[PDB]
């Protein structure tokens, strides 16, 4: 799975 930084505000590490 990819480890993708993400934000909608906080930044989070999404796991895809």
> Given the rule CB under 8 A, which residues bind a copy of itself?
1-16
Q: Smallest gap, in angstroms, from Cβ of residue 16 to a copy of itself?
A: 8
Choose among 3, 8, 5: nearest CA to 16.
3
Q: Distance from CA of residue 16 to its chain's centroid?
A: 9
Q: Smallest gap, in angstroms, from Cβ of residue 7 to a copy of itself?
A: 4
Q: Smallest gap, in angstroms, from Cβ of residue 9 to Cl ion?
A: 4
Residues 6+ apart with CB under 8 A from 12: 5, 6
Positions that interact with Cl ion (CB under 5 A): 1, 8-10
């Amino acid at each position: 799975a990819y480890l993708l930084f993400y934000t909608e505000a906080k930044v989070a590490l999404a796991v895809k």
